[PDB]
Symmetry: C3
Subunit: 138 residues, 3 copies
């Protein structure tokens, strides 16, 4: 699924040419999905304002089929936040990320819908079961 969208007022000319590629590789591992279907939409130098002022501020969204829940959400947000403060030089008291759960049958990749089984993170549970066996009875 994944679609990481970053709206910031930070001007593109102040953005490391390798930011979208770093974020791409970070969220590919984070959401445990193929790198081939990971979008990163940078909206740099956006006419965005937060709190009525115009400092380094960011509003990011993560669209994902499954993977998203309170425990993982917070983890990802922290990582995205840390990656914004250091590379976009924003703040952390000026960053809001919204995680958007996407129904599998409401999302069309390559002339087909998604598997509802992945929306229920069933591929991870089955990995959980696999790794269990290995180092719980070889």
């Amino acid at each position: 699924m994944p679609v990481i969208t970053v709206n910031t007022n930070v001007a593109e000319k102040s953005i490391p040419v390798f930011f979208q590629a770093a974020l791409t590789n970070m969220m590919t591992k984070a959401l445990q999905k193929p790198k081939e279907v990971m979008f990163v939409d940078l909206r740099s130098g956006a006419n965005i304002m937060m709190g009525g002022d115009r400092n380094p501020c960011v509003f990011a969204t993560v669209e994902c089929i499954g993977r998203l829940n309170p425990t993982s959400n917070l983890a990802m947000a922290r990582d995205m936040e840390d990656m914004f403060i250091e590379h976009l030089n924003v703040r952390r008291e000026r960053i809001v990320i919204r995680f958007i759960p996407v129904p599998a049958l409401f999302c069309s990749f390559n002339g087909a819908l998604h598997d509802v089984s992945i929306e229920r993170d069933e591929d991870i549970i089955s990995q959980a079961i696999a790794e269990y066996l290995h180092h719980h009875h070889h």
Copy 2:
């Protein structure tokens, strides 16, 4: 309701001047709603990347009050996809469309909310019943 949003890295200068009007008329019929309330937001030459590369790639969204479900979703996605490959010259293994169901009482067109009855596709069922009668007992 309808709001078709297309984020592509394809430069506006390579976009048929009649693309937004074609897509507009396609999705007006598809979602069975007035053409007057159909938005098409083209975000051409967007700083969007998919898979860490920068080929012809697309992330479209369809915001609709009702109409949206697994069977119609897939149909629309296919049509939108076909309309992107030929007019935006993207790919099909580089297109992801997200269908977003919109609550009728969470969407304000012209100083009023929407009818919850349309969110439940009750105008189509009633059309279904009408056409039934016609060619099932004149």
Copy 3:
């Protein structure tokens, strides 16, 4: 939470320099949240078309943690609408606002998630109870 996003084809050069600050202060009071965490993303001179024509048209979204419901939604929409007609010189039969309810544990502000209690508007009920007592038994 709040994130007010305005996509209009109205050119930035025709937008009062104080529009985003007016809308910011309006929706800060409306959604009863700190002004510090209110985003306004203006997408002026957007390649957006509605009805297949290119008049003054607007598609706004309100992302909020709680606050949003049929009675308040309509109120806000009316106010936003009135603020678009007069300052963006759009129409009112050319404005659609979508209110998006945001799960508190699916939204990360400043290295933490949001309080689920605010998503249930429990801070307002408690204010309701407080003010009740005052002018119902001093």
